Point group: D2
């Protein structure tokens, strides 16, 4: 075995060490070719045909770039080939746990199908990784290339999911703490995963990426912070970091949370729920699993991909008729109709436990307007989106360490006010989208009146088109005009 | 209904007329989302996740751009909105007949599964188009927007597949002849289909595109040629056109005929053949079809996409065991091994009827070298590739008309010698690739000796690495050294 | 004369009407080839070799695109070919008044050389335009293509500089008000000039552009607002507009106000001041002008370009020795040294009349630290930069009109709170940079102590590296720590 | 001093070793900021504002990339940091000898002004380099970083211009022969200089680059060939190399030899010739030089840049009136008129000594057509362009060595016939362009008749528009029709 070269449109020619090739050439990894990165986003942005596979290669490549760069600048860190390979493998493998249509599956479907469970793609990645290693005899190959499976497997998993519980990590000691900041940065979110998806998603979406990760890599250094060795950024690059999160937020606003992409994800989720009793996936020892239970057996999960969509769409079984009809309405573009968007005001924050009650509230509103139809709770969908800088209300740049050119080994902190007054005052907000499942002209007119009335009753912000869609409703609220 | 905007990474924001939206939002068209543009190419170029869907949008867009541009420069042509819509629809729909993995299906699978049939994606496109129109009530909508279904449906089909047999077309008269040169140019191959795939494939492959279609559109004009109105290019742009075909050939050499992408297509084709008896696809009136017969019923063909690959891979049926094993070997990257490449010499041309005899010839060669194993015909795959400028031995630029700035309405011809002596002397050639199905070190060593010996016996060109892979064989042939 | 095509790396093949060609092919316009778009920026960003010439072509092109797009969507506006040409010409000609090194000349040099004068490149553009027309016999050519010089020349000038003083414009009536929003938008700054520079500067700088003007053009419409016809943007595009200004601010932070690019501009300005007595530029009737007075005669101003830099650098005249030495220090990269950056706190705002007093304040600070050298006012440079969203403290999106899909003719307003809580709370700030003209190690150490002490005394923000450069100074200030 | 980072739009963030920074920050190098890469090309392609400075940085960067890559793959080569720095410096400095408007100066001007001299930019680069080193105290700095000035300066110069005289080089021995193939490859032309200009020129021209140098670097290796260690390319990459030269030839056809860019270069050259007696450039010890003699004194040559154009344009001296008028006609776009293009036939090859006789031949032709004016030799310009693959009639790929994956240390040769029959049969040709200095309609009509008659008399190829521009002349020649 020798090194392979892969040509990636985003990063160019990437070299893969033979051990990485071995990990990649397994059913568990190759599975990612059949999972769209952006789920339902492809149904709005036709360039977004890309899958988790190629993103994982990129993440693995960049993880290697950063660890190599640090080793070259700072030989005193004693970064070994072994460390590099482990960081690359964690990079390659942090997406292994994704399900059909990526975030649709763990963000919408599993929470509704198995409310009692607490599941994340991160956890799934660790489980799939263990399955990949054991099913394919990778441990001996790791030993052949100088890795120590016991410690290094633990390291790799910790890089993906955090401590499997004071230094809380066992795979490496504090003197190598900075290695835990590369693939999945739990401290402030600044990691190579973002860097790849910014660049790759932009390339495919047809929207231009504003963040320069190559620059960041050039200016990164390791310094001592509170008895840990951590990655620090050059002081003057702080603005670029603020911009990185701004870019992330723009991408969510323009693409990842696109109102129609989301309703498509929602429709697909509904079809999966209606199919979940009837689709069987064979796992370990021939045992049969459902879409919602395949997460319990990695052998079954290996075979759970976007393919399920087409299996349902092309099914002839009358049991799958309701699920199949939903997908067919997607194809004919008879989608649930977007009614509008609003936001909470002041300190008001909508809790997850209240999401189910919201359609009922909308249907209970009593707009003083003449209506041909009356709508019921089940006619409304309410989608609540939490937008933030990756740390709820917290500013991630408060959790970043910097260095200055006159003392490159001395770590410092930079506050928001030392950067600019043009920065956000808050770092989190919620958007509420409302859609109507009845798509005829009269139902939609009515849905608009209910929605705007509900916004007024709850003291939410005025929808942007409120005066046009509900001219009889908006004047009651002085605050709006 | 009003016009929709779609954002495409290649062309930007494309406007779609409501009638086009209606055609697009049907199962027949949306199907193209599940068919990879480059088939097995994705297994070599991980950026090439793109599907026929987005390519079709682009072709439809560019077709519109060119016809609009000509109408704006030359009002005297009397190009109508009706003409524009018809050309856009033909652009959109010329890929409707593609099967799983695009060219794999009509280039390898159908020829082996149904040798008696003569099938092409072009023919399939016309059938799928008719099916799309009839199944979805499109005719009334066409009338609503000023089209005349009888004439215009004929025009659209003729644009895709040529005369459905003097002027041989019925959908438009000779004064609109130039319209037939936009979507699928049967005269010289210069059409909007190439322009989109050059740009889109390059974007995804990570290889840079050298052809500027926007420039070409700016310099295009309609002039009278032999009592037809044809599209002419500005004289000085002739070099750019030679370059366009050079680019096409480079793309085939680097990507579309990549030796490993082709062997993956071949392995997938073999799995399909082994599954063909057992997969059933439901068509019109509940009748059941096979992969190879789905082409006879468009209702069934609608459901025949890349999904078949995963249906086989994930199958548990013991009947599908052999097919499923082939695909699994793809996942583990245990692929048939490439042995080498050579070309015929002089006037020698390999005929299609002789393709089957070639593995037998290779196995019959008697290299004077010590071999642990003897290989048989069934161990060898011989792939013959015809590379040309789109017209067999003919130079397509001999079939292009030009105009000069001093007389923009007078069409002229330009010969190769009026352009450059650095151009090709021939416009067609054949490549022969040999692979071995036995992948162990000793079988591959042997396969190399047989292959090189066969090249020598047939007086084919010396493989580039011949002296390295078969040092005992190459010296016998004086011609090589 | 017929239309010319130009190939631009940003916009592709641009078509130029013959009248535009005639305007372009004059000494007054071609001058712009010898004036760098980014001035001293090229000395930091080596890709920024681009000149005002090519930017002007782009602005003229985009101005045409927008006016054409609006006319095609809304024929009822009665936009004429004449209107289009006039808007294109204003676009082409709004940069004609730039001087050597663009903003350096009217932003730094003229204010210091001729404090009594009030001069702007805008004013210069109008003067140069009039000169161009009269010197080159353009009026007859304009009449030949259907323009009415009296009204249209007025219109063009008004588009550049605003009313040459109710409806305050004379070149077009209120029903064509929207035309005044294309080239130089005095209401909110959203114009084609920005669009071209964002794209072109980014292409040359090596920083990626986040704003999509093509999208914006597609969604733009004209609606009635307060008895004027104005350009409106689609409601949901409001986020993209906020982002456009954010992008502009990032470009200023990263590139246009780069600390070293600015000090280079400052050094060049100083050399020009020292040369201003001795360089003579011949204007109308052989009369001689200086660099600072060439603005009074357009014939002389025509010959005032970046060339002055080299004329000084290559001079042998002993009178120009001091000016020439400054430029030589640029070449050897012996630049004034950047000491640091800080900002005012609270309501504090530095007025233009106080800029001269600032070096003196820095030199008067009394840091309690042992210093080998004492520095004087003349050793310090203080550069005060006003950063905003183009309207001082005002939010430009408050001055934008929108429309919604359900009523495309009805203009509406959108507030900040209807968009996001992640937006800036303020839209303007000031940055203060300090540099030292003594570049030796001991002077620079001292300069750092003075600077930080001055920040503390004035209650400015703590410099980011303050604790490292002045550890003995920073602890006195509790606010900092 | 520590390493600097520069952001280049083509290569990204490039790191510069402190010694390189010192070389760059001198008047001799910074000079290159005032010399356009493409000369008169900017007057046709307005994006091509780029200068030799930024190209030199890129060449220096890529030279470092390649030497680093080879050292990392093959530690047994013993490539030292010293070797790397020397190769970078040669890359940085191989453009130091370019004159105003780059190839215009050594390709047109010097050959006409100083026919007796044999001058090339290469020679100029060595002289400027020596001047740079000596004038700026660089030798000590080189010693400080481990270079040995005697040997290393010799090595650097040899890399630029070849042996200054079996192994003909003194700066390194045969075991380091491969180092001489990086910056300026005298064997086959495949070097980092091309790679940068392909990418950078394309970026600025608005034409897309087809060659992937990063790929080439990844597949490059050093192997023993005829008792030298040389750079070898992977066998299968041979097609990409053919394509690289095809790309180079396309760029010449489309841009570098653009008919109008060339006539502008010719006009500028004529102005320089007319100014050469009167412009004085001050060199060593105050001595005065002319444009054509500044090459004899590097102090003077340091000050000879594109500035000369503007010095002439802006001059008031009546002696410079004729030169100044030529440049003014450029600004008004009153250029010499292109008449047509043709090529020699068969074995016919035009020698340099016959270039001067060609205008006379054109004027002596006797077209049997009625002409209002008779034209003289001095009215015609004949531009003869030799287009090739960099080695006259020779195929450079015959001078490239390859390796195969099965024996990476064994160098091999590949012939054209082992690659493709679609490759050129010849590797050199000549183009003849004719222009007329009389631009009125009747002169140009007449010029066309003379030109086509001359083509017919000389048995050159038929101009593409021949039948249109000279319908009475073309029928006499049966060969044409
Ligand atoms: N000419 C090319 N230009 C750019 N990318 C290419 C080119 N050829 C192939 N690629 C891409 C496709 C793959 O991602 C990657 C692997 O390339 P390739 O060198 O063809 O691998 P290989 O496995 O077929 O060759 P090998 O015989 O060396 O193993 O490079
Ligand atoms: N900010 C953005 N930048 C670039 N492209 C975008 C942006 N938002 C959406 N798109 C792309 C994705 C889709 O292919 C296309 C659809 O645009 P959009 O106007 O969001 O559709 P829509 O159907 O949601 O609008 P409408 O509200 O009229 O229905 O544009
Ligand atoms: N092959 C090419 N690709 C892209 N741009 C090109 C090409 N050739 C020329 N250009 C650019 C340079 C100019 O900006 C613009 C003008 O092209 P060109 O057609 O050569 O004008 P021209 O004036 O020389 O031809 P004409 O003979 O029509 O007057 O296009
Ligand atoms: N935010 C940015 N993004 C991209 N390029 C940048 C950015 N800032 C600066 N550049 C460019 C300008 C230079 O070509 C190169 C390095 O600039 P910069 O890091 O600011 O140098 P510097 O000399 O100001 O820093 P210092 O001297 O503080 O080490 O990168
Ligand atoms: Mg391989
Ligand atoms: Mg610096």
């Amino acid at each position: 075995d020798t090194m392979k070269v892969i040509n990636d449109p985003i990063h160019g020619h990437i070299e893969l060490h033979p051990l990485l090739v071995r990990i990649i050439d397994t059913p568990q990894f190759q599975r990612l070719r059949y999972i769209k990165q952006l789920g339902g986003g492809y149904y709005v942005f036709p360039g977004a045909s890309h899958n988790r596979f190629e993103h994982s290669l990129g993440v693995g490549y960049l993880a290697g770039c950063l660890v190599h760069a640090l080793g070259e600048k700072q030989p005193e860190l004693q970064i070994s080939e072994r460390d590099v390979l482990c960081v690359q493998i964690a990079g390659l493998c942090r997406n292994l746990g994704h399900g059909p249509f990526s975030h649709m599956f763990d963000g919408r479907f599993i929470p509704l199908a198995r409310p009692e469970v607490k599941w994340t793609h991160e956890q799934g990645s660790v489980m799939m990784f263990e399955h990949l290693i054991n099913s394919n005899g990778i441990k001996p190959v790791m030993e052949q290339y100088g890795l120590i499976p016991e410690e290094d497997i633990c390291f790799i998993k910790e890089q993906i999911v955090g401590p499997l519980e004071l230094w809380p990590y066992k795979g490496r000691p504090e003197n190598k703490s900075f290695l835990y900041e590369i693939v999945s940065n739990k401290r402030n979110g600044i990691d190579v995963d973002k860097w790849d998806y910014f660049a790759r998603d932009c390339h495919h979406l047809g929207i231009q990426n504003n963040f320069d990760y190559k620059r960041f890599i050039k200016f990164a250094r390791v310094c001592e912070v509170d008895n840990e060795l951590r990655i620090c950024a050059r002081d003057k690059e702080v603005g670029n970091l603020y911009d990185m999160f701004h870019t992330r937020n723009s991408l969510h606003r323009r693409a990842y949370q696109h109102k129609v992409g989301n309703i498509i994800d929602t429709m697909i989720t509904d079809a999966f729920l209606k199919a979940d009793d009837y689709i069987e996936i064979t796992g370990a020892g021939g045992k049969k699993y459902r879409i919602s239970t395949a997460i319990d057996d990695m052998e079954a999960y290996t075979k759970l991909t976007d393919n399920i969509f087409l299996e349902i769409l092309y099914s002839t079984d009358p049991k799958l008729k309701d699920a199949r009809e939903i997908l067919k309405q997607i194809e004919y573009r008879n989608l649930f109709k977007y009614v509008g968007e609003t936001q909470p005001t002041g300190q008001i924050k909508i809790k997850r436990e209240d999401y189910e009650s919201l359609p009922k509230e909308v249907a209970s509103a009593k707009p003083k307007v003449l209506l041909d139809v009356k709508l019921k709770a089940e006619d409304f969908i309410v989608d609540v989106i939490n937008m933030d800088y990756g740390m709820q209300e917290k500013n991630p740049i408060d959790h970043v360490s910097f260095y200055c050119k006159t003392a490159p080994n001395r770590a410092i902190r930079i506050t928001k006010n030392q950067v600019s007054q043009l920065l956000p005052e808050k770092f989190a907000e919620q958007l509420i989208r409302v859609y109507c499942k009845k798509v005829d002209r009269k139902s939609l007119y009515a849905a608009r009146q209910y929605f705007v009335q509900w916004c007024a009753d709850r003291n939410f912000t005025k929808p942007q088109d409120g005066d046009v869609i509900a001219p009889l409703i908006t004047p009651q609220k002085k605050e709006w005009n």
